[PDB]
């Protein structure tokens, strides 16, 4: 009306993010990029470069948010970001909610309005279960699976209030939500060492496709991607043996995980 | 000399933990009961009539955990708890660590020890997912997911020293065990609108145990984990509280 469709993408770690980032802006999409620590934001956002090429109207923020601390982080009062510009160096600014960066972007010709999240529940476990700490699973599973659900809920809740309120809307691709699980959340595929890391994507994937069902008569599109092993950390000889039991699946890498997203999201 | 092997039995709800206690008892174990209230422990504990027709070292006992309020039950200076008798109504007991029941019952001849654990991870979800909050997000979670790994690994921890602790214990004839218990809901077909988390944290379950199996392979430990239908409470797809303590005891004993 013109309405100017934005990403949210959530928790991203290993260049992940920075990746499925880039494929949406390539494609003309916003982002508002949701890390949890000013580093891991900065790794994440696209470059000035890709900035600048981008079609007039393109935004991109970032927000600074601890997965670590769910359920606190819900309740806090606002949120400190950062704003991006194609010609000076970013700027702090502070939002209301996690969607407010589409209302400050917005005027009377343009609306931009949260089209897609992608959880992409990054959290990585390096240590067997008899070793690890309460605080340690907390953690995996506040970044990887809780928080990941709350984002999930409160999206929908808002994709279902936007096409009651901007009725045009039904023109636009379905609203989308993506959440990322790992090769590790079933199957043959189990390493020591990745004990709740592995029970965090298999229930980030379950809820997932419980979610769908529950989804089946609105209009709202749910799905889980469950990509293999993505280059670096992350090494016993059967599984190197193991991860051969087949290709493409076994591995993978950001590029790949940033396309696979966008033919679920370009799908019709 | 004489090593008595003794079961934990963990969020038992809608009887099942009712039936696996019942099996346990009649094979000849002792139990500990860890129920969320006084209400739940009650329904778990077998009754005083089959407790007087147990042999005479058989012992149960129940401690109150709220497992809701995970990590914090982990920092405890002490549980309260009960102990049955065959021949007297229950005595209130303090107990300093969830074994420490084993080293109550033992005398110099007789030493009671933690064989066998089942996490029953209870909790049911009726609420559609975006209708949850996530205060009944956390204490789905925590119930089903979060205490059981904790109960798991503060177990194997428990398993491991004692026998180092006991070299006699390697001739027993059932091998440290655990086994927890997921739901058919947890995969594959059976997708129930209002059941996204509970689904969640059960094939959350599902997945620790099998993982944890491989890192308890060159260990004594049996880690196993069990897939029910869907109990007689709500409405090989179907089970009965029942049917699954048979298929808990011959998990244990083959």
Redesign the interface.
Known sequence: MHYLPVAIVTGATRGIGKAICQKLFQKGLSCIILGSTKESIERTAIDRGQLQSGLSYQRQCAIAIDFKK??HW?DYESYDGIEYFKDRPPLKQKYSTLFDPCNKWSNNERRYYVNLLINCAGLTQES???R?T??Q??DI?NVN??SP??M??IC??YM?KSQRRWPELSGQARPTIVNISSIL??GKM???????Y??????????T??????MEPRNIRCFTISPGLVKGTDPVEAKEMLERTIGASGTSAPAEIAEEVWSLYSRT
């Open positions: 769910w359920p819900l067997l279960s008899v690890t309460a605080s699973i907390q599973m699976f809780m659900v709350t999930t809920n929908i809740k279902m959340h079933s189990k390493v020591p060492g990745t004990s709740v592995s029970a965090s994507k298999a229930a980030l994937s379950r809820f496709e419980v979610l769908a069902a529950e």
